[PDB]
Amino acid sequence: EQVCDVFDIYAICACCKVESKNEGKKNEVFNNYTFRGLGNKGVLPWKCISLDMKYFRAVTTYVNESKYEKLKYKRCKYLNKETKKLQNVVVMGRTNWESIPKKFKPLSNRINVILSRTLKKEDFDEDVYIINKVEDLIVLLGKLNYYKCFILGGSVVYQEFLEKKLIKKIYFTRINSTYECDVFFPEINENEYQIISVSDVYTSNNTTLDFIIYKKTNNDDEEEDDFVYFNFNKNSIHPNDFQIYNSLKYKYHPEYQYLNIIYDIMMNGNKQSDRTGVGVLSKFGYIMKFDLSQYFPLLTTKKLFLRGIIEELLWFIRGETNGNTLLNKNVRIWEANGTREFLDNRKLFHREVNDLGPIYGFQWRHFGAEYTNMYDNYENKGVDQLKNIINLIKNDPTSRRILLCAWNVKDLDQMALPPCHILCQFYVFDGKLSCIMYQRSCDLGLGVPFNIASYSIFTHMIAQVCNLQPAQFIHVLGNAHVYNNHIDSLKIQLNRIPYPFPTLKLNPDIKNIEDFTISDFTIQNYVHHEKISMDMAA
Amino acid sequence: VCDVFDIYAICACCKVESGNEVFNNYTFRGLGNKGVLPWKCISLDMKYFRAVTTYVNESKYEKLKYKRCKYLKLQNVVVMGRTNWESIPKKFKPLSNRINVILSRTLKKEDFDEDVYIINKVEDLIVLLGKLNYYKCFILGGSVVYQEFLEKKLIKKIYFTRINSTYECDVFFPEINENEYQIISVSDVYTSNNTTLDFIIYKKTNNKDDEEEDDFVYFNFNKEKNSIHPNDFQIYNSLKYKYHPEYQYLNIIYDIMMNGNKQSDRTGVGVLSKFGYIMKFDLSQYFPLLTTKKLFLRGIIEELLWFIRGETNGNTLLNKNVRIWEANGTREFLDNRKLFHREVNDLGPIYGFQWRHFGAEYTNMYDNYENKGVDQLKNIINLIKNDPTSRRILLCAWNVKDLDQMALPPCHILCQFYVFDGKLSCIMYQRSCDLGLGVPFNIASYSIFTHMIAQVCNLQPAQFIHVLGNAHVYNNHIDSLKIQLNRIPYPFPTLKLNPDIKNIEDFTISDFTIQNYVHHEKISMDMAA
Ligand SMILES: NC(=O)C1=CN([C@@H]2O[C@H](COP(=O)(O)OP(=O)(O)OC[C@H]3O[C@@H](n4cnc5c(N)ncnc54)[C@H](OP(=O)(O)O)[C@@H]3O)[C@@H](O)[C@H]2O)C=CC1
Ligand SMILES: NC(=O)C1=CN([C@@H]2O[C@H](COP(=O)(O)OP(=O)(O)OC[C@H]3O[C@@H](n4cnc5c(N)ncnc54)[C@H](OP(=O)(O)O)[C@@H]3O)[C@@H](O)[C@H]2O)C=CC1
Ligand SMILES: Cc1nc(N)nc(N)c1OCCCOc1cc(Cl)c(Cl)cc1Cl
Ligand SMILES: Cc1nc(N)nc(N)c1OCCCOc1cc(Cl)c(Cl)cc1Cl
């Protein structure tokens, strides 16, 4: 029995990102050591992240009474002993202690302990224990009645507790912003500690953050029976391939909505072939939800560029169907569907190369108008859906008819291809806008991460020009499939741990949906793993 | 008394041949016929029975050995009547892995061996259970065994299989006093041997690592509603396991009632609403016709047959006493739609028109539209038979161009189909869902449609997946939904189609039969007049 398990000694910290160099930091690398800034100038690097404070307080103050008698027995056995409100103990480097504002001290409902050489009990007015050696802390825990013991930091205090192998778990807040720092959390050794849980992502005081838990690596109840009774009733891909993924206990990060779908398709999907030969695995009907008020959901388990998909979005809004516009901005999302061959194979022998036909943009601005060619002038022809939904959101917000629909049955065969994203339904409550997008056909490997981002942005754009705040983006998948030759790559991705999401900012001067331009969009604090080739062949 | 020795009954009860029929828990009471079981094989019940009576947990025994002695290879005790035993096929006797026990008089240990037990009277088993080292004790019954054991109040849990079909029977399970026992769990619904069934669990009433368990609390540090009370949902909350598919609809009602946003609507009524729910029903296992209130299906089938005809004439339905579209077809309703030049009950280019003629120009409800617009319905049928893995098998009612001409825009946006291994699944997207009156009907409708489409395409139905956009409960529906929430569902009915019908246009009202619909009594959602 080691000292850490017996005495239930844990660390808890909060780390931001810190100011590196600008010599090629458009394309920089990220890892766990990305978040490492602990202090600056004897205080915290940031003003107030109240949600972290709330977390910190709740963890360090939470005790479970019933669980104690069994810890009150474990510790006693270790020290050779037989067997008013239970409190946790918290330990602080002296400098850490000085940094805390007076009105917070001693930390309420906790047994305060302070590490110091240069100071002694006489230097303190407060109900606190002073100790001058780590060893004395162990001696003290021996004597006291407590639930858990949390090391509250000091990088010095952190360093010495890790290297003595005293920390059973690190409760770690990732603060997804950059600040000046002079003090840093020790680099965690991946062989000594592994992440086992990952929380939801939140925003607090203008930054996203999540909370992760590292664990030390070792290298009534009648109704519990009823559960077994009621449980009395394909692809054998290999366990080990999901070592990391399957080791996590809590996968609460929103990116897991995506990743669990992949997992599900890999384990349970249906083997099917296209009329061609390319094999997929597929399943029918999934849903993901995303809280746009808390983060922007750009996947972090691989790198995504957003310029293209933003250009495509602006191109939809202008009602364009001319692929050349996109190619001239070096965006090739639609190149393949615009070739002479692709159009001929679509029986559009009379369609000019890159004239995509009555697709999205056209349906959004001119539904029902007779498509001629990509250069025609369609103004006041067809139904301006975009305008009407913006008008409904503004003037009739309780409407259950706020739908934007790409799927024009009549023009389907004239489109280079039918829309993958069928429709958008909007919802308004309490000055907040939510949006369901229904997608009939979903390539999970490449399509889906881009599609989540596109419609997230669109919700922001619509909300803003209607003076509302974005709320939920809800993505419905009909035929959801993975390409067989993406399997190895998705395997890799599925074992990366997500990072806290970035945030999206829109120029606030833009007040009509038609008036956005590319430089009106900024992603801030995109932290992400390395880019992946989905087929390992190119 | 019973709490200590862990004595439970386990049964299976079908419905009995009875010359308005009322349903309650007593509806399921058929135990046996001619000294045999009323039904032939029901293989899933035999699997449940074997699994429950055999299963043991050794790491939970010490707690019970502690309990029993104080008061004074681990297996379970199984107890039956003589008649009961003399009907089990010998190739199953002795009951593999179970302390076999018989409660008889006429015979004793002078006939059969000592490894198998035989006992004298009711309170000659308790005595025999001190002597014994066993997990739990199951009364496999026989009518009188059950009877006398419930009589003496020696039963803690009844594990009760509801067989949702009717057979001739000579013996019945006794009435269970619902003041003495209550249901705390209800399972998923299943099809076995041409019948649906579920498994419920009765409980006697009380009427006088841990590392990660903490970590769970932390992740909850930030957790967060409406003027609905707790004690009104007594029965609903007092259930531990709610695996019956009907809870997919009821849980949504609960969620909107607890967490719904207050809104006043189109007319000024009051609704609670949320946005985005999903439900899934396994059509190969049952027909999802709600059981916690009475539903009628003639009208909705006629609406569907009307849609398939491509009809937009509301008078066709009114002449059959299908009044679903009545209010939408009145002079006054259409004038308020700015449809001053539309004949009454001419609903415009709605569903039928869209499914058979999307894109054609609408004139009036009497015109001939033959070969005008796209026949979506014909097209999706061809895709299903000839290109089953297509991801474009969709039937879309929402014609943006025609919306304003419709009496009202479709509540039911679209249907997507999916085919794999001879089976057909369907997703229906619904933009606006009146959870109280509308959605129970909507579920039945597209379920039936999915059957119709599968059959004409030579496939088996698989899943109906209902996606809900704006999901709302009417405020004046609240009291009734509360009553409904505390009702326990019954096993679902089945839908039979006439197997002769092989083309989508050939169905008639007489080609549809609902079987074994067991249901609670009718509720009026608006409890006013
Ligand atoms: N964001 C976060 O999660 C956290 C941030 N912080 C920040 O970090 C900074 C402080 O970190 P740091 O400079 O490392 O200071 P520390 O809190 O680590 O304090 C170090 C001091 O504590 C005492 N001490 C440490 N180890 C021993 C030992 N075992 N025996 C006796 N005394 C010991 C000594 O006190 P003495 O000088 O009296 O001899 C030493 O100088 C501040 O900016 C603070 O705001 C702190 C905690 C958490
Ligand atoms: N569907 C289901 O869940 C089940 C159905 N069954 C069916 O039930 C039918 C049998 O029911 P039924 O005959 O009414 O009941 P039993 O099978 O329990 O048979 C009753 C017999 O048990 C003995 N017995 C009853 N009370 C006592 C007592 N106080 N002390 C000692 N012995 C007693 C008597 O046998 P003796 O002559 O020796 O005195 C009596 O004749 C069968 O057809 C069987 O298939 C059986 C179990 C479960
Ligand atoms: C803030 C924090 N957050 C996390 N997740 N872990 C910590 N150890 C931590 O530090 C706890 C000790 C410092 O406490 C404070 C410091 C300052 Cl500067 C202020 Cl203003 C308030 C408190 Cl409580
Ligand atoms: C089958 C069953 N299922 C449940 N759920 N409970 C029972 N008591 C039960 O009866 C078990 C005792 C009767 O057993 C049999 C009777 C006949 Cl007739 C045959 Cl063929 C086979 C068995 Cl096992």
- Residue B69 is part of a domain; what is its CATH number? 3.40.430.10
- In chain B, which residue's Cα lies nearest the Cα of A250? B216
Rounded to the nearest 5°, which phi and psi values hold at B306?
A: -60, -45
Nearest to B366 by CA among B332, B398, B343: B343
The angle, 0 to 180 degrees and rounded to 10, between the axes of the packed helices A447-465 and A255-268 is 150
Closest ligand relative to A47 C-alpha: 3
The strand pair at A183-184 and A193-198 is best described as unpaired
Task: Round to whole Å and give the CA distance between B444 and B496.
Answer: 13
Mark yes or no for CB contact A273/B389 under 8 Å: yes
User: Can you tell me the distance from the alpha carbon of A484 to that of A462, in angstroms, rounded to the nearest whole number?
Assistant: 37
- Tell me the Cα Rg of chain A: 28
Eight-class DSSP state of A185: P
Residue A168 lies in domain: 1-217
Q: For A20, how many CA atoms within 13 A lie in the half-sphere containing its CB?
A: 16
Whether residues B407 and B479 share a domain: the answer is yes
Instruction: Please indicate whether residue B86, judged by its CB atom, sits closer than 6 Å to ligand 2.
Output: no
CA B278 to chain centre: 16
Give the catalytic positions of B in this structure.
411
Contact A54 B211 (CB under 8 A): no
Contact criterion met (CB < 8 Å) for A472 and B266? no
Burial tier of A512 (Cβ tally within 10 Å: 0-12, 13-18, 19+) = exposed
CA distance B454 to B445: 14
Return the CATH number at A447: 3.30.572.10
Residue B237, H or E segment? helix B234-237
Residue A99 Cβ < 6 Å to ligand 3: yes
Contact predicate B447/B495, CB 8 Å = yes
Question: Residue B491: is the preceding peptide bond cis (ω within 30°)?
Answer: no
Same domain, A299 and A364: yes
Here the tokens at position B121 are 């009277």
* Residues whose CB falls within 8 Å of the CB of residue A72, separated by 6 or more in sequence, listed in order: A83, A145
Nearest CA among B519, B330, B327, B345 for reference residue B440: B519
- Could you identify the residue written with the tokens 């139905």? B461
Q: Hey, how many other C-beta atoms are within 10 angstroms of the C-beta on A377?
A: 7
Which protein residue has the closest C-alpha to ligand 3 atom 10?
A: A152
Question: At what angle are helices A134-143 and A71-79 packed, to 10 degrees?
Answer: 120
- CB under 8 Å, gap of 24 or more: what pairs does B403-406 form? B404/B337, B404/B338, B405/B339, B405/B348, B405/B349, B405/B362, B406/B347, B406/B348, B406/B349, B406/B350
Residue with tokens 């474009």, as numbered in its chain: B392
Long-range contacts of A405-408 (CB under 8 A, 24+ apart): A405/A363, A405/A367, A405/B398, A405/B400, A406/A359, A406/A360, A406/A363, A406/A364, A407/A363, A407/A440, A407/B394, A407/B396, A407/B398, A407/B414, A408/A358, A408/A363, A408/A367, A408/A368, A408/B400
Q: Which atom of ligand 1 is nearest to the CA of A12?
A: 3
C-alpha separations of A140 from A110, A129, A143, A426, B103 in Å? 15, 9, 5, 59, 65
**What's the rounded Cα separation, in Å, for the pair B16 and B38?**
9
Residue type, A329: K
Last residue of a domain, one of A167, A197, A217: A217
Q: From CA A451, how far away is CA A290, in angstroms rounded? A: 13
8 A C-beta contact, residue A282 and residue A272: yes
Q: What's the CA gap between B355 and B376, in Å, rounded?
A: 5
Q: How many CB atoms lie within 10 A of CB B476?
A: 15
Give chain B positions within 8 Å (CB) of A232. 47-48, 51-52
CA distance B243 to A234: 24
Which residues, listed in sequence order, are joined to residue A469 by a DSSP beta bridge? A432
Residues near ligand 4 (Cβ within 6 A): B 10-12, 36-37, 45-46, 48-49, 84, 87-89, 92, 140-141, 161
A407/B394 CB distance under 8 A: yes
Residue B445, amino acid:
S
> At a CB cut-off of 8 Å and minimum separation 6, what does B29 contact?
B13, B15, B16, B172, B173, B175
Ligand number nearest to the C-alpha of B122: 2
Q: Same domain for A136 and A68?
A: yes
Q: Please state the residue numbers annotated as binding site of A for NADPH.
A: 14, 38, 40, 42-43, 94-96, 116-118, 133, 154-157, 160
Residues B465 and B525 both lie in one domain? yes
In chain B, how many domains are there?
Answer: 3
In the numeric block, which tokens belong to residue A57?
A: 């307080």
User: Max alpha carbon distance in chain B (Å)?
Assistant: 95
Is the same domain home to A107 and A2? yes
What is the torsional sign of CA B365, B366, B372, B375? positive
Residues B94 and B467: their CA atoms lie apart, in Å, by 51
In angstroms, how far is CA B312 from the centroid of its own chain? Answer: 33
CB A443 within 8 A of CB A258: no
Count CB atoms within 10 A of the CB of residue B372.
Answer: 17
Give binding residues of A for NADP(+) as ranges.
14, 38, 42-43, 94-96, 116-118, 154-157, 160
3-state secondary structure A115-148: ECCCCCHHHCCCCCEEECCHHHHHHHHHHCCCCC
**Distance from first CA to last CA of chain B, Å, rounded?**
51
Centre of ligand 2 to C-alpha B103, Å, is 8
Q: Which ligand is nearest to the CA of B197?
A: 4
User: Who contacts B131 (Cβ-Cβ below 8 Å, separation ≥6)?
Assistant: none
Method: X-ray
Write the Ramachandran bin of B77: left for phi over 0, alpha for psi from -120 to 50, otherwise beta: beta
Residue B228 sits at φ, ψ, to 5 deg, of -110, 135
- What's the rounded Cα separation, in Å, for the pair B466 and A99? 56
Please check if B341 is assigned to a binding site.
no
> Which ranges of B7-109 does DSSP label H, i.e. alpha helix?
43-54, 61-71, 82-85
Determine the length of chain B.
Answer: 529
For residues A149 and A290, state if they share a domain.
no
Q: How far apart are CA A64 and CA A84, in angstroms?
A: 14
Peptide bond into B94 cis (omega under 30): yes
Q: What is the resolution of this structure in A?
A: 2.4
The CA-atom distances, in angstroms, between B44 and each of B10, B80, B105, B162, B515 are: 15, 21, 33, 12, 20
Give me ligand 1 centre to Cα A99, in Å.
Answer: 10
Element (H, E) at B484: helix B478-485
E strand or H helix that includes residue A431: none
DSSP string, B141-192: E-HHHHHHHHHTT--SEEEEEEEEEEE--SEEPPPP-TTTEEEEEE---EEE
Handedness of CA B475, B479, B483, B486 (dihedral sign): positive
Q: How remote is the CA of residue A94 from the centroid of ligand 1, in Å? A: 5
Does B243 appear as a known binding residue?
Answer: no
Cross-strand pairs, B358: B374
Distance of alpha carbon A515 from alpha carbon A189, whole angstroms: 50
What pairs with residue A39 in β-bridges? A183
> Is residue A175 located within the same domain as residue A238?
no
Please indicate, yes or no, whether residues B296 and B406 belong to a single structural domain of this protein.
yes
Q: Which atom of ligand 2 is nearest to the CA of B107?
A: 38
Q: At what angle do helices A50-61 and B210-219 cross, to 10 degrees?
A: 150
> Around B221, how many Cα atoms within 13 Å sit in the side-chain half-sphere?
22
CA-nearest residue, atom 23 of ligand 4: B88
Nearest chain B residue to A389, by CA:
B400
Q: Which of A197, A405, A418 sits opposite B392 (nearest CB)?
A: A418
Distance separating alpha carbons of residues A302 and A495, to the nearest angstrom: 11
Q: Determine contact, residues A39/A16, Cβ cutoff 8 Å.
A: no
Last residue of a domain, one of B145, B174, B205: B205
Closest CA–CA distance from residue A508 to any residue of chain B (Å): 27
Q: Domain check: are B477 and B403 in the same one? A: yes
Q: Which residues pair with A9 in a beta bridge?
A: A149
Alpha-carbon radius of gyration of chain B: 28
Looking up tokens 């999706």, which residue turns up? B380
Distance set, CA B134 to CA B7, B78, B149, B153, B376 (Å): 11, 10, 19, 21, 64
Helix axes A447-465, A307-317, angle to 10 degrees: 50
Give the closest residue to A166 by CA, choosing from A6, A342, A383.
A6
Q: Determine whether A63 is exposed, middle or buried from the number of CB atoms within 10 Å of its CB (0-12, 13-18, 19+).
A: middle
Residue A117 near ligand 1, beta carbon < 6 Å:
yes
Of A420, A424, A435, A442, which residue is the catalytic one? A420
Sign of CA dihedral A232, A233, A238, A242: negative
Query: In this structure, are A120 and A246 located in the same domain?
Result: no
A199: chain B residues, CB-CB within 8 Å: 219
The reply to whether B267 and B233 lie within a common domain is no
C-beta of residue B344 within 8 angstroms of C-beta of residue B334: yes
User: Taking CB atoms and an 8 Å limit, are B219 and A197 in contact across chains?
Assistant: yes
CA angle A234, A237, A239 (to 5 degrees): 115
What's the token pair of residue B429? Answer: 């997207």
Residues B320 and B414 in one domain: yes
Amino acid at A355: D
What CATH number is associated with residue A248? Answer: 6.10.250.2210
Ligand 2 lined by B81 (C-beta under 6 Å): yes
Backbone angles phi, psi at A380, to 5 degrees: 65, 15
